[PDB]
Amino acid sequence: YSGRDSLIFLVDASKAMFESQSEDELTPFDMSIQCIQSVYISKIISSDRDLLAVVFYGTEKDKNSVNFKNIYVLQELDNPGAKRILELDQFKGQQGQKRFQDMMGHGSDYSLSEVLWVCANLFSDVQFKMSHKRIMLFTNEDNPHGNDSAKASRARTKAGDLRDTGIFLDLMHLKKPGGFDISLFYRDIISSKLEDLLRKVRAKETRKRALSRLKLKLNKDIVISVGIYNLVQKALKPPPIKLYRETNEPVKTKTRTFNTSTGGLLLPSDTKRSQIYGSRQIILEKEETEELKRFDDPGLMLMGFKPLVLLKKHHYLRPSLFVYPEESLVIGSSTLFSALLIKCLEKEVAALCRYTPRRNIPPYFVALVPQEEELDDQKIQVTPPGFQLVFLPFADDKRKMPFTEKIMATPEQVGKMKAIVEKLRFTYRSDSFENPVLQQHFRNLEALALDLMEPEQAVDLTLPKVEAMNKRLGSLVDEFKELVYPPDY
Amino acid sequence: FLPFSLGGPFRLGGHGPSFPLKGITEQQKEGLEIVKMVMISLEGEDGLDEIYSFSESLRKLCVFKKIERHS
DNA sequence: CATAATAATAGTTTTTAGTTTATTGGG
DNA sequence: GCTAATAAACTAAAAACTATTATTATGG
């Protein structure tokens, strides 16, 4: 399943968007530009399968497809790009505001129905599948309808039209944040995020589709259609793209085998695999090697049920995954699987199976820990019920350790470090850390793509502090440290 | 090592529980007695870990024991 | 052995298993 | 007293979803 998400930015530009607004800081325009720039950066680092656009209502020099009055379109629906970032940042700050005034002006008449018209036209413009559409609109007007009520009625009609079409609009306080003083009129049929958007959290990708719809074969007769769903993947930087120094042109890389004996070229068919063992040069075929890697057909042949005691923390392998029934070519799988899942309190004994994720690969035995339905009171189902794909290590997977033995230590040190670690308690949060390398790489990209003077070095929570935990624990860490002759040299 | 197997008894084509031992050559019984009276006091650290048996060696590359060097 | 047809084949993208760089390592 | 089992890329990754074009079972 693919589909592009769209978010369109609409901001007032007539008179109240370039004012102090009962403040001494910058006009709403400046940090509105900052916020939309932040969401541009977040989207760029997040996903490139989405389109964004910017339109201003209130216009002295109109430019749009339908050529209405007081309607100006800057950037249409398109994937965000560095040139878009430059275009947006050209109109940031006071210098950006005055440049905008020089090339755009201010002080026209809003026409909300025309805005809805042009935004609907923009949505019609894209030829891609629209998974989701969203409109945001920020202005200092809680009710800009002191003008003719005909315009208000037409705007309401167009809002109903776009709601029927599936378009949703967003507006929130800008003039007087807080107090529920905004949307005096828009509260009828239209339903703070400033910090959330300004936080511009990035370096997060998004899942598009699952994988590996496999069969649970309990026997040679009955099968169950299920799909293995990932939940964690080791993220990494996008692969480098080979380019030409002079022209920054993509390079048609062309790798091939060759022979210096005759200067000709070898086909992938006449090049045979070879091995060396003992006193012989073992020769093999590529297809023979592939068959050697092949053991049986992909599937999940149930092997039995093993009590949830053989699993040990020190016995671990490649990450476990999630299993969900998928009734696309076998029906009745979902109901039976659900019946199995709910009966887990008695089914503490974990299911045993040998796993063949894909074709022509050796199978690994994998236990199936029944996942639970951890529904939240906020109606959020975290980790829906299923099975854990815990991999069982083989006999050859264990490396022998020295058999040095140590006897129990004194309990007074045990108690003193018990107090130490109890005082030094850290509330673990699963989503509380990001890889410094990847986020730093993203900072470099966003930096060395604009005309940025120097890069920003985002502070990570991974780096241990020097004294914050020490003061959180006090000096008792050294006061209680009564070990004789510390191993320090 | 006895020519026969030593030691889910029948999961898939297993060995018999036991075989007659009074019908074998008396010399073989004497040799088994001699080797066992020498061996009960000394078997080997590998045997303490796991004994190379007649059937386990045959089934798998038990003596091969693929493993890497010290980490 | 024809033509308002019809569909069961293909084709673009996600993510794992392949191999080179480099650092503790003696007779 | 000169030969490391390290793990950054090695190298080109058996993947589906959502998009169109060739067969026909048949009107003739």
Side-chain angles (χ1 to χ4, degrees), chain A residues 26 138 200 207 215 245 255 259-260 281 408 412 475:
Chain A
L26 306 187
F138 281 161
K200 60 150 191 161
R207 172 255 184 188
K215 298 295 191 69
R245 185 184 68 189
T255 175
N259 63 97
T260 61
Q281 177 197 27
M408 186 66 204
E412 60 93 3
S475 280

Side-chain angles (χ1 to χ4, degrees), chain A residues 330-360:
Chain A
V330 169
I331 319 296
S333 287
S334 175
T335 78
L336 178 55
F337 201 89
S338 62
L340 309 184
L341 287 181
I342 63 188
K343 308 307 169 52
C344 171
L345 73 165
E346 67 182 8
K347 194 173 71 178
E348 48 86 17
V349 167
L352 182 51
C353 178
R354 39 156 185 163
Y355 182 39
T356 312
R358 303 178 288 99
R359 281 174 285 269
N360 319 112

Side-chain angles (χ1 to χ4, degrees), chain A residues 265-327:
Chain A
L265 281 79
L266 271 299
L267 272 300
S269 63
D270 55 13
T271 59
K272 286 200 65 61
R273 309 290 82 74
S274 52
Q275 305 282 44
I276 298 297
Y277 288 98
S279 60
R280 290 212 183 111
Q281 177 197 27
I282 297 286
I283 312 303
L284 204 69
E285 183 48 46
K286 179 95 169 183
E287 178 158 7
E288 293 294 328
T289 314
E290 305 172 16
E291 166 62 68
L292 283 186
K293 204 180 277 196
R294 156 190 198 188
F295 268 45
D296 51 354
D297 297 334
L300 277 297
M301 186 66 204
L302 179 62
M303 301 315 298
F305 301 95
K306 202 67 63 173
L308 190 152
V309 290
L310 277 298
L311 157 69
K312 292 146 175 50
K313 279 299 200 316
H314 51 263
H315 290 118
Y316 180 59
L317 270 194
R318 77 160 49 188
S320 176
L321 304 189
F322 173 80
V323 167
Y324 192 63
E326 202 272 334
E327 287 192 357

Side-chain angles (χ1 to χ4, degrees), chain A residues 111-324:
Chain A
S111 305
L112 305 187
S113 303
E114 278 73 358
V115 179
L116 308 182
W117 203 260
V118 63
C119 80
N121 294 314
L122 288 182
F123 289 168
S124 56
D125 292 332
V126 62
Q127 307 303 132
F128 301 126
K129 184 173 174 69
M130 185 64 72
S131 56
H132 168 278
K133 61 203 56 56
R134 179 66 45 172
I135 311 296
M136 61 79 71
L137 199 152
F138 281 161
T139 181
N140 315 336
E141 277 280 336
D142 49 1
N143 188 355
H145 276 298
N147 60 7
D148 66 277
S149 299
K151 184 189 283 290
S153 56
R154 275 176 270 108
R156 289 191 291 279
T157 310
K158 293 284 308 301
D161 302 332
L162 58 93
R163 283 283 170 87
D164 183 24
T165 316
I167 304 169
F168 321 116
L169 73 165
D170 189 6
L171 192 144
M172 173 265 257
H173 50 60
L174 207 55
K175 160 179 171 35
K176 287 196 292 267
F180 201 63
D181 311 325
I182 194 67
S183 83
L184 312 188
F185 163 77
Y186 300 137
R187 63 188 62 199
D188 47 4
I189 49 184
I190 300 156
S191 310
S192 75
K193 64 190 62 61
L194 290 162
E195 305 82 3
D196 199 349
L197 304 191
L198 282 163
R199 192 166 66 257
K200 60 150 191 161
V201 290
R202 52 198 176 283
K204 273 80 72 179
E205 307 302 312
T206 305
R207 172 255 184 188
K208 186 263 290 180
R209 204 265 318 279
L211 74 164
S212 60
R213 285 92 181 88
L214 282 183
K215 298 295 191 69
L216 286 176
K217 55 173 70 66
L218 317 179
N219 60 6
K220 309 156 307 307
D221 177 30
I222 71 173
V223 295
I224 295 90
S225 284
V226 296
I228 296 90
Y229 274 63
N230 264 291
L231 60 86
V232 64
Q233 312 85 348
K234 188 259 171 199
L236 73 165
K237 47 190 159 78
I241 303 184
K242 297 180 184 293
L243 282 176
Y244 191 36
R245 185 184 68 189
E246 208 161 346
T247 65
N248 322 115
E249 184 176 358
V251 181
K252 286 154 71 178
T253 176
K254 195 198 318 168
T255 175
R256 79 216 187 171
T257 175
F258 186 77
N259 63 97
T260 61
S261 62
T262 57
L265 281 79
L266 271 299
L267 272 300
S269 63
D270 55 13
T271 59
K272 286 200 65 61
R273 309 290 82 74
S274 52
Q275 305 282 44
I276 298 297
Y277 288 98
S279 60
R280 290 212 183 111
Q281 177 197 27
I282 297 286
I283 312 303
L284 204 69
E285 183 48 46
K286 179 95 169 183
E287 178 158 7
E288 293 294 328
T289 314
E290 305 172 16
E291 166 62 68
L292 283 186
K293 204 180 277 196
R294 156 190 198 188
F295 268 45
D296 51 354
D297 297 334
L300 277 297
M301 186 66 204
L302 179 62
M303 301 315 298
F305 301 95
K306 202 67 63 173
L308 190 152
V309 290
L310 277 298
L311 157 69
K312 292 146 175 50
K313 279 299 200 316
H314 51 263
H315 290 118
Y316 180 59
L317 270 194
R318 77 160 49 188
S320 176
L321 304 189
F322 173 80
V323 167
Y324 192 63

Side-chain angles (χ1 to χ4, degrees), chain A residues 433-461:
Chain A
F433 310 98
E434 72 277 14
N435 164 272
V437 176
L438 293 185
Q439 68 90 24
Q440 179 183 185
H441 175 84
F442 291 134
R443 302 312 100 76
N444 293 122
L445 265 294
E446 65 203 80
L448 205 44
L450 279 300
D451 213 337
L452 207 62
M453 294 299 291
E454 302 308 318
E456 65 182 1
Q457 276 57 238
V459 173
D460 49 345
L461 296 92

